[PDB]
Amino acid sequence: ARKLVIIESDLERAEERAELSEGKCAELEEELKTVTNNLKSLEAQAEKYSQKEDKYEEEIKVLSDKLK
Amino acid sequence: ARKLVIIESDLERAEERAELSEGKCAELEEELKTVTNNLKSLEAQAEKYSQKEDKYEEEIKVLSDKLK
Amino acid sequence: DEDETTALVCDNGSGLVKAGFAGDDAPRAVFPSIVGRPRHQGVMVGMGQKDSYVGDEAQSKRGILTLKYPIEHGIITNWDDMEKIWHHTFYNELRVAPEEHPTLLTEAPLNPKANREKMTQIMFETFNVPAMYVAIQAVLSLYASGRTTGIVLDSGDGVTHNVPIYEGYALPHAIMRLDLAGRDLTDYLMKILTERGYSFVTTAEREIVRDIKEKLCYVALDFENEMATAASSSSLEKSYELPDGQVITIGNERFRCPETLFQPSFIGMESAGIHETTYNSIMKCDIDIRKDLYANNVMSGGTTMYPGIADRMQKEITALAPSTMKIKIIAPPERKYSVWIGGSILASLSTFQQMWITKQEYDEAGPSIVHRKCF
Amino acid sequence: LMKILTERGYSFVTTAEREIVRDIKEKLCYVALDFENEMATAASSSSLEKSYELPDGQVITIGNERFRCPETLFQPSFIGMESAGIHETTYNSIMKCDIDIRKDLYANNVMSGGTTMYPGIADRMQKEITALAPSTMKIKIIAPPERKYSVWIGGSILASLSTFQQMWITKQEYDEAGPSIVHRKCF
Amino acid sequence: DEDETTALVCDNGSGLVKAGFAGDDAPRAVFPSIVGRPRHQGVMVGMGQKDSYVGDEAQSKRGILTLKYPIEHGIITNWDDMEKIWHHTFYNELRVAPEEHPTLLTEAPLNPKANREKMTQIMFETFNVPAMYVAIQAVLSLYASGRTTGIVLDSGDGVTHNVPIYEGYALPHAIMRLDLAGRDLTDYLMKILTERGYSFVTTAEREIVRDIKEKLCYVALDFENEMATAASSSSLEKSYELPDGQVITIGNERFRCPETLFQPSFIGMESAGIHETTYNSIMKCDIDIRKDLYANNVMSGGTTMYPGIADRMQKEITALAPSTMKIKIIAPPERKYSVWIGGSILASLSTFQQMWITKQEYDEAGPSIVHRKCF
Ligand SMILES: Nc1ncnc2c1ncn2[C@@H]1O[C@H](COP(=O)(O)OP(=O)(O)O)[C@@H](O)[C@H]1O
Ligand SMILES: Nc1ncnc2c1ncn2[C@@H]1O[C@H](COP(=O)(O)OP(=O)(O)O)[C@@H](O)[C@H]1O
Ligand SMILES: [Ca+2]
Ligand SMILES: [Ca+2]
CATH class of the missing domain: 3.30.420.40 (ATPase, nucleotide binding domain)
Structure with missing residues (x-):
């Protein structure tokens, strides 16, 4: 009978720690979803910017030749 | 005796999902910090690439005028 | 909204249907074009199966659906299914009757003459459409x-x-x-994945390929230089843990399939x-x-x-x-709805009267009325 | 169980006491979570030695016998099969x-x-x-929880269904299609 | 025979291995691909069990063998066993060393790239094979x-x-x-036999099905007309007294399984x-x-x-x-050895040099040397 009362004291402790973790875990997952969205977004722009400078330098090289 | 087993089982079930959640939550939290750092890093590079290709835009323009 | 018949706006393809309310700017409901059977036996009594499953209903639960493709470039294996596909659009979501408002559709260039009449027959004869057109x-x-x-x-x-x-x-x-x-790209990837062992067989997971594709996959700028880059494991190995439970490192698989676009030689053609x-x-x-x-x-x-x-x-x-x-x-930038933007216009044009078809006009010149007069 | 009990000497031979095994089983016997860790626990005499004074008159301390038999469920190798x-x-x-x-x-x-x-x-x-x-x-x-009567709960339904007429067999239906009438039409 | 290295001829599958001497026309030794354990405890001392039993040795006495299938389409659950399966072929029967003659194998189309290298590793590194190929x-x-x-x-x-x-x-x-x-046909019959009560459970008798199959079983010309024929007991009820001791009248069971070939709908596929x-x-x-x-x-x-x-x-x-x-x-007519007939050719071709792989060629281009250059 006494053990029936003691066993309950440990149950509530694990339930709260699990809920508290789930609360932050979901928040971190949501945050990650937002960050990863901008990550690939910036990566796409970075790749685009890299494509621009490559074409610019190529054209500039031609302009220099024609200038001379 | 049966009630004890029912609750005792719940403790094992609560403890299991708690250590599992906290374990992954901690791993996730640590991962977010790494991803966030990568975001800040990539964003910085993208900024340098953006300001660079823009400098070429005004450079390729002035050269086109001198060529003309 | 209320006064004036007010026409709807639609744009049906061979993969994704675009349709919304009336006088809108962009599609409000874009349900996937899928309709299969329960090769399995539905629970048979846990509903009289039928409904091959469609709309967000089918796409949500592919698993037990033998997705049967009705419309394959030109030929429609079966028209009977299309009837109950359109019976869902105008009603279940839009909550408006086509027996009240006109209708606008899209025309797939060089489509069999018999098809443009078969469709119109469904409208004029059953859905009573005194005014419509197919641009x-x-x-x-x-x-x-x-x-x-x-x-x-x-x-x-x-x-x-x-x-x-x-x-x-x-x-x-x-x-x-x-x-x-589209559909051609979704069909080609599964074939090429077999070289690595991965073989998405059935037509259900075939769709998963299309879903995964539009998130990371990209086109090769120059396959030659990108091949030597494979030595590194940073720009190649991409992470995408299957919602099921098995990562697929799509590295050299992303920029391999798109190469077919520039090289149709890989799909048996000149x-x-x-x-x-x-x-x-x-x-x-x-x-x-x-x-x-x-x-x-x-x-x-x-x-x-x-x-x-x-x-x-x-x-x-x-x-x-x-x-x-x-x-x-x-x-x-958003060039997918470019057709929808133009669609909302034609439906609102008045000169449109010079082009559209009226109830009686379909009976006077027969079924060919449409592409026998216009182009 | 009777086969494995022979290792300790206990041998419930005839088919009458064979049933007693089933009766005793559904009162204390349980399944091993992990036979490896539970084996080392045998050193202690608290969670193992279980009391069940035979209604006849001879205690059987079912300690390591409770979670031994159920192991066969997960390990059919102990009953000659792949x-x-x-x-x-x-x-x-x-x-x-x-x-x-x-x-x-x-x-x-x-x-x-x-x-x-x-x-x-x-x-x-x-x-x-x-x-x-x-x-x-x-x-x-x-x-x-009470998953034994889950079939009985569903049984009371079919017997009350009207669509059931589409499935059930009528007197005359058995003579028209012969004896096979049942599983020759349905599944 | 003596002069010139003289290459062997082989053709390994996922069920039956075909291999003989050199310069032959047809396989000389076709042992079954089986390797299980003595789930039982061998007599344990009446030999240190090990040998899962193989070749005519295992097939002769299945009884006490838990036949474990290593090669299942693509994935090999374990490679360790394959090593001692090939250590029997070249020696116990052919009585010739692979560290002397080339080798020819077959290629299962669309097999994981990692597999073709794992195999070659066993030859070049241990069995020292300066010349081989996989067609x-x-x-x-x-x-x-x-x-x-x-x-x-x-x-x-x-x-x-x-x-x-x-x-x-x-x-x-x-x-x-x-x-x-093959293996798919052997697996499907046992499932369908359960309708009559017969249930060949363990994987040992599973093979007996395949043995019995290739003696009387046939394919349905038209299941519709053959079903009405069941009324008669002449063309249906077939006699095959089990070598054990129990007749199995395979009547409607013979032409039932093959129907799956034409109807893959019975095996969950489109x-x-x-x-x-x-x-x-x-x-x-x-x-x-x-x-x-x-x-x-x-x-x-x-x-x-x-x-x-x-x-x-x-x-x-x-x-x-x-x-x-x-x-x-x-x-x-005998179309089973059609691959073996062609195999004896490639092994004798000289142009083969343009295709095969040499010892040094494997180290220069790395392990991928094979399917990175050829197709
Ligand atoms: N964000 C996106 N990025 C790249 N492709 C996309 C994106 N969203 C959708 N798609 C693709 O666009 C195609 C569908 O475009 P859509 O204009 O509806 O085609 P159709 O009208 O020919 O049916 C599909 O191949 C789909 O994967
Ligand atoms: N005389 C025969 N008639 C019909 N099937 C046969 C006959 N002899 C062998 N088979 C079957 O052929 C298959 C083995 O053929 P094989 O070419 O060796 O296959 P694989 O190379 O795919 O292992 C087995 O299914 C076997 O039952
Ligand atoms: Ca289109
Ligand atoms: Ca084969």
């Missing part, structure tokens, strides 16, 4: 900018169309029809890259028409959102073609 | 179906039968299923 | 007749292959890979009958290529020896397909 995909994406001189390339899941529609339409051949879009077909539509027209065509090239279709699709065009077009004018391609 | 544990057969029924059917199957697994009332029968499933199988969906097994 | 099943059955224009369908126990290899190989997709051959896949490989290629394909269709594989396998093809192919050319299928 041409690309031309709609046009009338929505600020010039009467641009070449358009519209495509998605159906077939590719290189339509140099700017000042007018139809003269020698110029325009092109190529069965190589068709050249999309930059040759560009010449094929330019060399035909007059000589004093080119300088301004290069200055404006419309690229519509959500398919043209793959990273590395526009920057490649400037590399191949400037190669084997005149190079003393302004080479410029207009690739609208 | 069949794997019930967690492999689970995969055997999942790998066959379509690919886009799994994520929701794990989210729902019905376990019926009063046999699944042995302490340590459900908690083991989560350990073995999550091991060699996809692990990014909701692993969830529905083990109805 | 493609179907293509071998070809080069052995008298024409350079025929479509081949090769299969046995592994997986089905519809390879239209005649003038060349590989273009769009045409070719097909289907996990439905794949159509083998006569649809035929169209699937013909419709892809050019238009002016068909008339001669129908005039020649190679059907290889001992699986195609079931009574009622060829006559059905003429019924279904002539149905939904062009019908103004010569419909003709070449089904070689």
